[PDB]
Paper text:
An ExoN variant with a nuclease-inactivating mutation (E191Q) was used in our crystallographic studies, as it was expressed more robustly and generated a more stable complex with nsp10 than wild-type ExoN. The structures were determined by molecular replacement phasing and refined to 1.64- and 2.10-Å resolution for the tartrate and magnesium-bound crystals, respectively. The final models consist of nsp14 residues Asn3 to Arg289 (Val287 for the lower-resolution structure) and nsp10 residues Ala1 to Cys130, with two zinc ions bound to each polypeptide chain. While our structures of SARS-CoV-2 ExoN–nsp10 obtained in the two different crystallization conditions are highly similar, they show notable differences in the exonuclease active site located around the “knuckles” of ExoN. Another magnesium ion required for the conserved two-metal ion mechanism of 3′-5′ editing exonucleases was not observed. The previously reported SARS-CoV nsp14–nsp10 structures also showed only one metal ion, bound at an alternative site between Asp90 and Glu191 (21, 26). This site is unoccupied in our structure, presumably due to the E191Q mutation. A comparison between the Mg2+-bound and free structures shows a significant rearrangement for residues Gly265 to Val269 including the main chain atoms, accompanying an inward movement of His268 upon Mg2+ binding.
SARS-CoV-2 nonstructural protein 14 (nsp14) exoribonuclease (ExoN) plays important roles in the proofreading during viral RNA synthesis and the evasion of host immune responses. To mitigate the low fidelity of RdRp, all coronaviruses encode a 3′-to-5′ exoribonuclease (ExoN) in multifunctional nsp14 (10–12), which forms a complex with nsp10 critical for the ExoN activity, and additionally contains a C-terminal guanine N7 methyl transferase (N7-MTase) domain. The multifunctional SARS-CoV-2 nsp14 consists of the N-terminal ExoN domain involved in proofreading and the C-terminal N7-MTase domain that functions in mRNA capping.
Numbering used by the authors:
A (entry chain M): 1 to 130
B (entry chain A): 3 to 287
The structure:
């Protein structure tokens, strides 16, 4: 009974971060020890003619980005654990997230380490120019 | 292929919207094409779903510098025999709104303690994961008849995990600086540990120099067995699966080869007693 959601390649990293006190630190240290990034994300087939904004309601990837489902790029959604927001809300779930193509191999790691510029709506260091 | 970890146990026939699906596999078939997914303007995302997510299938085989291993070798466990705590869980099956996963019902320890918990699972919502009570039924069988009245005698998990930390602290504070959960078929026991175990780097107690064995979510502090009053989580425990030592058959048949003073199987504490008893006879004779 039921429908599987994950693949065996993610079993180690997801189990490790699902038990950790600081899951963000756990995933960063997991990558630092040579661990494979979380795969099985929701990669979007899009026109790549989007605005390039970081977090959008529709895929807005440009020629230098890949579009992903927001929930699939959130470490806390992938591990089914609490989000750091005091209300428990998620900044990515229900939205699409644009990831630079050079960082598309680890979408979960990119959203965990980078911040969206509140002025122009693009990633600081990956689109922002404020 | 796929794994059973984080399996969606809801009865909803449709998948998830690409923005709400945690994985590519959980996306609804309507959005999938060419190995990717497409956004379809006009098909809205669901805002009222509750999908029970299975916690069966954890694999604690990570190798991260600075993080200790949970599962230890037999020789390491023998060195820390003073920290051995037998551990077993009798579970219940999710029903009604979900099906396909088991939930911890009666947690037993080699100290003779049984803790009955309210059937609680991890439910994915459009906003986050909801740790809440779920509909469950006892498993069919005459050896599981004693679990039927326990379905309406459980405690909230916030109280259960505090009692676990209190029981382990009173038992091991004068015996060892750690805990070694002695297991038989670690699958569901490891699933139950998700409810009361946290891991991380080796920390020291906030009041002394001993290593940290407990964690408090209310204060974000760490403590040893001596100073863990009020703490709710076991921190960096160790464990080993006796069934993986080359035994054939169930737990009681192998336990009875060495011991004749323990019985009453399928009760959580009694299985935990037989597990620790079998581990002692197998390792030190
Ligand atoms: Cl250690
Ligand atoms: Mg049992
Ligand atoms: Zn999230
Ligand atoms: Zn900017
Ligand atoms: Zn202390
Ligand atoms: Zn015995």
């Amino acid at each position: 009974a039921g429908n599987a959601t994950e693949v065996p390649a993610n079993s180690t990293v997801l189990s490790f971060c699902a038990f950790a006190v600081d899951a963000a630190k756990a995933y960063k240290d997991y990558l630092a020890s040579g661990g494979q990034p979380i795969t099985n994300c929701v990669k979007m087939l899009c026109t790549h003619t989007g605005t390039g904004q970081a977090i959008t309601v529709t895929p807005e990837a440009n020629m230098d980005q890949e579009s992903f489902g927001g929930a699939s790029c959130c470490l806390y959604c992938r591990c089914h654990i609490d989000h750091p927001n005091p209300k428990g809300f998620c900044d990515l779930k229900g939205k699409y997230v644009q990831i630079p193509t050079t960082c598309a191999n680890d979408p979960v790691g990119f959203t965990l380490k980078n911040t969206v510029c509140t002025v122009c709506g693009m990633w600081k260091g990956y689109g922002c120019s404020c | 292929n796929v794994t059973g970890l984080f399996k969606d146990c809801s009865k909803v026939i449709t998948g998830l919207h690409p923005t709400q699906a945690p994985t590519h596999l959980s996306v609804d078939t309507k959005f999938k094409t060419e190995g990717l997914c497409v956004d379809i303007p006009g098909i809205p995302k669901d805002m009222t779903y509750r999908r029970l997510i299975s916690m069966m299938g954890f694999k604690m085989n990570y190798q991260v510098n600075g993080y200790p291993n949970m599962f230890i070798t037999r020789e390491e466990a023998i060195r820390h025999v003073r920290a051995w705590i037998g551990f077993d869980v009798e579970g219940c099956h999710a029903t009604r709104e979900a099906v396909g996963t088991n939930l911890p019902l009666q947690l037993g320890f080699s100290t003779g303690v049984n803790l009955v918990a309210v059937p609680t699972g991890y439910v994915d919502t459009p906003n986050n994961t909801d740790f809440s009570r779920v509909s469950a039924k006892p498993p069919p069988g005459d050896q599981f008849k004693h679990l039927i009245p326990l379905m309406y005698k459980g405690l909230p998990w916030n109280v259960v995990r505090i009692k676990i930390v209190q029981m382990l602290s009173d038992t091991l504070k004068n015996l060892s600086d750690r805990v070694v959960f002695v297991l038989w078929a670690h699958g569901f026991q490891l699933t139950s540990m998700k409810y009361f175990v946290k891991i991380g780097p080796e920390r020291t107690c906030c009041l002394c120099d001993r290593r940290a064995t407990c964690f408090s979510t209310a204060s974000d502090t760490y403590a040893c067995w001596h100073h863990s009053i009020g703490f709710d989580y076991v921190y960096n425990p160790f464990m080993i699966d006796v069934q993986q030592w080359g035994f054939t058959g169930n737990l009681q048949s192998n336990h009875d080869l060495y011991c004749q003073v323990h019985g009453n199987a399928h009760v959580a504490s009694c299985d935990a007693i037989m597990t620790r008893c079998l581990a002692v006879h197998e390792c030190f004779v």
